[PDB]
């Protein structure tokens, strides 16, 4: 088979994690009991990617639920599809990280991380051929950010030849008042740039701006923000869960998307928020990006787009050709044929056709510049720095994470300015 082991950490990680499993359980036609009641065998063809077959007639998410506070655990257990998760795969602390990255990475999380790895190892060894891991978490908090990146480092120690993808939620003042978040984000990025294959930059700033200005929702809830996230995560895993044009595991997908090891931060997009020309134009539009960046402020290294629904395959080919032609300047010339397309016959629930966009753009530097700005504005005053030195951290570790993300930005700028000649 081709297993993915799913891991969700912290509050944000667990609720977008629960949303992901709700949406794809619906698509694959299994109910909260874990029983299949669908209509197409295409729902079960690659059911093994995210589910274990269990007791007679029962499918159980290969998912591991982690948090330093027991609160969200009950929330998931109480939420829809709460009874589909394997009880033993619930691993929780009493502690509560309190938005302290150090507590997640070095102290509280470090004490809990072993029992997490125990559940990982149990799921992994039951795997016919594990293709990799995915982590849902935020970078602004303490558990999902600090312990999540600790978990990544530990997993890569036992599984150094497995693919590690993250869906990382980026902190924004428009959604969270918490002042210390640019510290937690910069510290986490410092880890993600070294130890992951793909990071989907789910930016709360972009999620907010979409709900507000496009979806016309005054004061949007987390449920509003996460509906976009679940729709996106459903899209980026469509080719893995349904048989189609792609015969591609996580490694092959990363190989054709990541030209440089550090530059693996993707800005995702969705459409709509309809004709194929309309779909295609929207998905390349800055308003439809899940990361607060303007693609026309940089260049695309690689692009992948998934169309879903019954539509003209010929028309998709032509519109993709059209877009690249009219926007030639925004794709790097020294990587030929860097824009790829797939089509799935099975549309998402509610939409008769949609499109999920995965962009590896140098314009993602804008997101890292935003964090760097907010980070540096705290670190000048050493504001709230004693929450980190208290756990045992040194100011140097802050300087290194700052400069490493600065290097990342300059590196994106390097390839943005590069020419064929």
């Amino acid at each position: 088979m081709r297993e993915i082991v799913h891991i969700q950490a912290g509050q944000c990680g667990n609720q977008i994690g629960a949303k992901f499993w709700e949406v794809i359980s619906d698509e694959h036609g299994i109910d909260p009991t874990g029983s299949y009641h669908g209509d197409s065998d295409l729902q079960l063809e690659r059911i093994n990617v995210y589910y274990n077959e269990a007791t007679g007639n029962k499918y159980v998410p290969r998912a591991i639920l982690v948090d330093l506070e027991p609160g969200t655990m009950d929330s998931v257990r109480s939420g829809p599809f709460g009874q589909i998760f394997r009880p033993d795969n619930f691993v929780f602390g009493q502690s509560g990280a309190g938005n302290n990255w150090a507590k997640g990475h070095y102290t509280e999380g470090a004490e809990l991380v072993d029992s997490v790895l125990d559940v990982v190892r149990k799921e992994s060894e039951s795997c016919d051929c594990l293709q990799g891991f995915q982590l849902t978490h935020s970078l602004g908090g303490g558990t999902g950010s600090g312990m999540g990146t600790l978990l990544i480092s530990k997993i890569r120690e036992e599984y150094p030849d497995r693919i590690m993808n993250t869906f990382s939620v980026m902190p924004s003042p428009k959604v969270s008042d918490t002042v210390v978040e640019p510290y937690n984000a910069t510290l986490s990025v410092h880890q993600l740039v070294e130890n992951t294959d793909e990071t989907y930059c789910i930016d709360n700033e972009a999620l907010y701006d979409i709900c507000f200005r496009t979806l016309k929702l005054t004061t949007p809830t987390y449920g509003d923000l996460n509906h976009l996230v679940s729709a996106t995560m459903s899209g980026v895993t469509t080719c893995l869960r349904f048989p189609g044009q792609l015969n591609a595991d996580l490694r092959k997908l990363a190989v054709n998307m990541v030209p440089f090891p550090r530059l693996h931060f993707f800005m995702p997009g969705f459409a709509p928020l309809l004709t194929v020309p309309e779909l295609t134009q929207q998905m390349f539009d800055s308003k439809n990006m899940m990361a607060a960046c303007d693609p026309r402020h940089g260049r695309y290294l690689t692009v992948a787009a998934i169309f879903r629904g019954r539509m003209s395959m010929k028309e998709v080919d032509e519109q993709m050709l059209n877009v690249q032609n009219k926007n030639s300047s925004y794709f790097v010339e020294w990587i030929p044929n860097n824009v790829k397309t797939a089509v799935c016959d099975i549309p998402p629930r509610g939409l008769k056709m949609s499109a999920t966009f995965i962009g590896n753009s140098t314009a993602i530097q804008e997101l890292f510049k935003r964090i760097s700005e907010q980070f540096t504005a705290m670190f000048r005053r050493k504001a709230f720095l004693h929450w980190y030195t208290g756990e045992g951290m040194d100011e140097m570790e802050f300087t290194e994470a700052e400069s490493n993300m600065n290097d990342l930005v300059s590196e994106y700028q390097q390839y943005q300015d590069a020419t064929a000649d």
């Binding site: 990541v258 030209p259 990587i335 030929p336």
Partner: protein, 440 residues
């Protein structure tokens, strides 16, 4: 005797193998269970179709073939498909994890784990041959298995089978039907590595096949299914001389003598005609002259290039069906005085001609019209080097920035293998340029 063993590597290789062996079975009257009613010598024989098929005591006719992939889902469809009874389980070999479009994984990391088993299974086919002629290797340039594992296999086959002939059917990458970006890397690497171990290689440009399916068969958006059925017809035309008999039949090895003037110059350009739909073939006979002339229309080539802007070193015509020499000769005479056909000065200009009397077959529910006569031209043209030039350029663009290289280095490769492979390709392009310069 004179058996040929076919080896199908990776997704492209395997699925093209399906198309070919299905077509072979229809051509020889072999049923999906392997039974062949018209074959009266049970359990064996020295017939022409025995070059590609062995026989069991139960009357089953078995392809002299091995299917190999580092991932199981493509070959699994063969194991459960219409022709699953045709193949013995040990002919179908799969690993669990593919090469992820990475040459290094195909040639080293993943490939080395299965290469011994593959050679063992091939050895078991060879041991049943009374006069093995050589191998036919089907693979893509762009896949990690098609590139990496194939070159590993070709290297090992040279060691285990000396100078025994090895022919390739290689799929040249086209963006229209590919979702990979690193294929120029894999292409240059396998070509460099395989060059010394291949006696003759037939490149099939996916874009050429894609265009032909769109323009000639009116297929809106061709699939692998559409391409492979067309490719199988070209492969059939080329191997037909090995699988059928006939007075006017000329063996592929005899054409090969003409096609390869120097060891490295072993890439013939294939052109096939007629490719026509049922709708258009109704009430429209395609004469020998008409299909022969279509061989010099560049739109019908298996590889995108312009022979009219290059030089010929060989020209072969492989006919099948209702065709007699008189008509061939007349058609050729016309073409020679109306076409842009120019040979290098060190090679004779005559066209070598072969005719198999058994007419082309079509797969049920296919797109191709059933015709009374077809022809495949095999020419050695300097223009084929254009395909190298396009590929090498895409390589250069990415390699200058070392794009995607870390994936290869991470699996054990060095940058020195890249530059060395690229330099071989530069020398190859120069070789094709040098053979076209007039003598002193």
């Amino acid at each position: 005797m004179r058996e040929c063993i076919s080896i199908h590597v990776g997704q492209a290789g395997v699925q093209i193998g399906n198309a070919c062996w299905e077509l072979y079975c229809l051509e020889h009257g072999i049923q999906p269970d392997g039974q062949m009613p018209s074959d009266k010598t049970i359990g064996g024989g020295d017939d022409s179709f025995n070059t590609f098929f062995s026989e069991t005591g139960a009357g089953k006719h078995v392809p002299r073939a091995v299917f190999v992939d580092l991932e199981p889902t493509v070959i699994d469809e063969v194991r459960t498909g219409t022709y699953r009874q045709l193949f013995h389980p040990e002919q179908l070999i799969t690993g669990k994890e593919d090469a992820a479009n990475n040459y290094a994984r195909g040639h080293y990391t993943i490939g080395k784990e299965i290469i011994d088993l593959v050679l063992d299974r091939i050895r078991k086919l060879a041991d049943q041959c009374t006069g093995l002629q050589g191998f036919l290797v089907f693979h893509s340039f762009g896949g990690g298995t098609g590139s990496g594992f194939t070159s590993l296999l070709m290297e090992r086959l040279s060691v285990d089978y000396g100078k025994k002939s090895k022919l390739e059917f290689s799929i040249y990458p086209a963006p229209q039907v590919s979702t990979a970006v690193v294929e120029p890397y894999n292409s240059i690497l396998t070509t460099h590595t395989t060059l010394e171990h291949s006696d003759c290689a037939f490149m099939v440009d996916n874009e050429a096949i894609y265009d032909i399916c769109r323009r000639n068969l009116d297929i809106e958006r061709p699939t692998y299914t559409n391409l492979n059925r067309l490719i199988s017809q070209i492969v059939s035309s080329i191997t037909a001389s090995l699988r059928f008999d006939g007075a006017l039949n000329v063996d592929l090895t005899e054409f090969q003598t003409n096609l390869v003037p120097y060891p490295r110059i072993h890439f013939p350009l294939a052109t096939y005609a007629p490719v026509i739909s049922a709708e258009k073939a109704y009430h429209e006979q395609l004469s020998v002259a008409e299909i022969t002339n279509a061989c010099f229309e560049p739109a019908n080539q298996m590889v995108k290039c312009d022979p009219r802007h290059g030089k010929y070193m060989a020209c072969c015509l492989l006919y099948r069906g209702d065709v007699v020499p008189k008509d061939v000769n007349a058609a050729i005479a016309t073409i020679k005085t109306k076409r842009s056909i120019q040979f290098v000065d060190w090679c004779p200009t005559g066209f070598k001609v072969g005719i198999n009397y058994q007419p082309p077959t079509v797969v049920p529910g296919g797109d191709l019209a059933k015709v009374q006569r077809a022809v495949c031209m095999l020419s050695n043209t300097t223009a084929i080097a254009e395909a190298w030039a396009r590929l090498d350029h895409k390589f250069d663009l990415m390699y200058a920035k070392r794009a995607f290289v870390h994936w290869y280095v991470g699996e054990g490769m060095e940058e020195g293998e890249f530059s060395e492979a690229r330099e071989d390709m530069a020398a190859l392009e120069k070789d094709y340029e040098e053979v076209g310069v007039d003598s002193v």
